[PDB]
Design an enzyme around this catalytic site. Sequence first.
Site, PDB file in Angstrom:
ATOM      1  N   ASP A  50     -86.036  36.648 -46.572  1.00 27.06           N
ATOM      2  CA  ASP A  50     -87.462  36.896 -47.649  1.00 27.06           C
ATOM      3  C   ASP A  50     -88.454  36.315 -46.676  1.00 27.06           C
ATOM      4  O   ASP A  50     -89.170  36.894 -46.949  1.00 27.06           O
ATOM      5  CB  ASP A  50     -87.643  36.584 -48.861  1.00 27.06           C
ATOM      6  CG  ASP A  50     -86.201  36.920 -50.116  1.00 27.06           C
ATOM      7  OD1 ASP A  50     -85.535  37.904 -49.671  1.00 27.06           O
ATOM      8  OD2 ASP A  50     -86.379  35.862 -51.142  1.00 27.06           O
ATOM      9  N   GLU A 162     -86.238  39.223 -57.147  1.00 25.76           N
ATOM     10  CA  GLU A 162     -86.595  38.316 -57.838  1.00 25.76           C
ATOM     11  C   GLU A 162     -87.395  38.347 -58.527  1.00 25.76           C
ATOM     12  O   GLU A 162     -86.685  37.016 -59.947  1.00 25.76           O
ATOM     13  CB  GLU A 162     -87.549  37.373 -56.299  1.00 25.76           C
ATOM     14  CG  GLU A 162     -85.790  36.658 -55.248  1.00 25.76           C
ATOM     15  CD  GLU A 162     -86.697  35.938 -54.529  1.00 25.76           C
ATOM     16  OE1 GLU A 162     -85.597  35.293 -53.694  1.00 25.76           O
ATOM     17  OE2 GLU A 162     -88.192  35.910 -54.352  1.00 25.76           O
TER      18      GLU A 162
END
Lengths: 271, 271
Positions: A50, A162
């Site tokens: 990420d 997430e």
Amino acid sequence: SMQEKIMRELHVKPSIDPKQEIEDRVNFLKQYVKKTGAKGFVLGISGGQDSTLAGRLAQLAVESIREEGGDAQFIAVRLPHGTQQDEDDAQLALKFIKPDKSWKFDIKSTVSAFSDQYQQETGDQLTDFNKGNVKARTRMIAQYAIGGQEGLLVLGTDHAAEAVTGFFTKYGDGGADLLPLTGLTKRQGRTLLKELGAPERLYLKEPTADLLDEKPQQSDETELGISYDEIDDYLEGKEVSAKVSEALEKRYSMTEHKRQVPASMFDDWWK
Amino acid sequence: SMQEKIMRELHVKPSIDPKQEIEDRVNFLKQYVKKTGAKGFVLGISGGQDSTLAGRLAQLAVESIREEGGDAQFIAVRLPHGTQQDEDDAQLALKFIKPDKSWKFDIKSTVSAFSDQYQQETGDQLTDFNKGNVKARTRMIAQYAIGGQEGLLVLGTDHAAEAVTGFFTKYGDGGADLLPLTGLTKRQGRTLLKELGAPERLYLKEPTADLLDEKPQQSDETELGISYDEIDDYLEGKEVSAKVSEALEKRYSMTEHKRQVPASMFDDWWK
Ligand SMILES: Nc1ncnc2c1ncn2[C@@H]1O[C@H](COP(=O)(O)OC(O)C2=CCCN([C@@H]3O[C@H](COP(=O)(O)OP(=O)(O)OC[C@H]4O[C@@H](n5cnc6c(N)ncnc65)[C@H](O)[C@@H]4O)[C@@H](O)[C@H]3O)C2)[C@@H](O)[C@H]1O
Ligand SMILES: Nc1ncnc2c1ncn2[C@@H]1O[C@H](COP(=O)(O)O[C@@H](O)C2=CCCN([C@@H]3O[C@H](COP(=O)(O)OP(=O)(O)OC[C@H]4O[C@@H](n5cnc6c(N)ncnc65)[C@H](O)[C@@H]4O)[C@@H](O)[C@H]3O)C2)[C@@H](O)[C@H]1O
Ligand SMILES: [Mg+2]
Ligand SMILES: [Mg+2]
Ligand SMILES: [Mg+2]
Ligand SMILES: [Mg+2]
Ligand SMILES: [Mg+2]
């Protein structure tokens, strides 16, 4: 369905155009700097997918601002807690991002000072889990200190895969100024990295928060009991097994507080 | 007008009933914590008005829960950075609050470790302003560590008169789970604290963030360049000088990021 609602709230598309996603997200970064008079960005580069993606987008944004005759910079920062076992991958991420500046701040002495004080004050050693959240919040402090000293905004790496599980520390890695990855699923982030030319090691490895002293590099999937292919299938609107929808809808409901500003009596979402 | 919009957004009333504000805010705390199943609350007690008020409300909430046969507790925590010059007022606040539990965590060794590492890593001294924000964020870490260890929610003390100016550290004292004081102006909070039976030494105590080593106990007004009663007049819908309104409206816009979750391209409040 609840699945459709969660997709809408988290901004997820079933199908993307990777080039257009990159343009949209770089343009966002540029516009946010233009509007606010910001000097650029800081971001912790972990060696995970990420932060690799968000870091490259940041670098592209500041390069584009400069190409337009403006001023901007990007500081990438390594934030190991002592020796990080996948330092090699973090260095590879830096090599791909090619940030304007590459800084380092080892958080261990700060976390140790805190943990030692905690035991001195209370008689109690922090649990490994609670110490892990101190680490995540110390990384926030480090990035905000660099941003404050240097005049920069703190990027965050939250994305839909997430966000749906609340798999971030509240006011730790959740504490950021702006979010280039909002709405992306984990697989979609891999697609964007591919379009950008990233080294595959950075998106083939297991996602990890790597916060625990006793269980270092624990995979997210180990902690969650749900895989990213299950998460992504849910978020992309595929017809998934009922067990996946049950698990994710419960986690999403339980973690709404992490996706709202602190609750007051004037808010209705929590009732 | 923009004044009407800000007043509404910040949930400010032109006129209050102090006793019913107390009832409503205690009941908010009760209702919220019971929804979460958490054992109670933690809050940093500085000696100042806001934390004295929020702390006493918290204590009343947990006592009410126990009176109705439930389980709840409140931990008040002192968070000095070394020797706090107005410790005596903090001790007076504790005496007034009568919290279930009284804890202490001295943040100095953590802040010193951070500051020393910052200079080692970057070659740059951490400046007093940025160190002050490190102190506020270390206090957040401390409260979340206690909360995580003991199963409690972290109270925040934000209210309308700090909210409108963004006079809090982002993810420092801004980092909390729930906010009993939302919507109150400074003088409105003072009226509550007086109605709760606090002595004048507490409810007329000069506001300070007390974050700077070079300017300890600096008053908020010195830093803001405007006084709380001007802010309160604006928020309550009174006539103020063009000076005051222009200044508050500009600052409100400049600090919207502190009153929202991190910005993404899906948000428009920053534009
Ligand atoms: N000794 C104690 N013992 C126990 N408990 C306590 C103690 N002390 C405090 N407590 C507890 O804490 C609360 C609060 O206490 P309180 O009310 O007295 O404190 C206070 O008043 C208090 C608390 C802390 C701080 N203050 C003031 O805030 C300012 C910070 O702004 P600031 O200094 O500039 O710092 P910032 O980091 O908050 O904001 C700047 C950063 O924001 C980002 N940014 C900027 N623009 C921007 C944008 N357009 N979009 C997106 N992001 C953007 C960038 O990352 C940038 O770097 C600066 O003016 C400070 O002086 C006040 C109390 O009620 C207690 O509960
Ligand atoms: N080594 C590095 N070098 C450089 N940069 C980095 C490194 N590492 C990370 N970075 C940077 O950081 C980002 C993020 O990295 P990433 O994606 O790999 O990390 C991760 O994956 C990562 C990072 C951090 C954490 N995770 C997980 O989240 C959970 C947190 O526990 P948790 O228990 O969920 O803890 P919490 O404090 O977040 O939430 C609990 C608290 O919330 C309150 N509360 C509870 N209920 C409730 C309510 N109903 N209303 C109101 N409040 C309520 C209470 O105060 C309660 O205590 C737990 O399961 C953790 O394992 C994951 C990266 O992308 C990088 O930018
Ligand atoms: Mg991540
Ligand atoms: Mg990771
Ligand atoms: Mg205050
Ligand atoms: Mg230097
Ligand atoms: Mg104060």
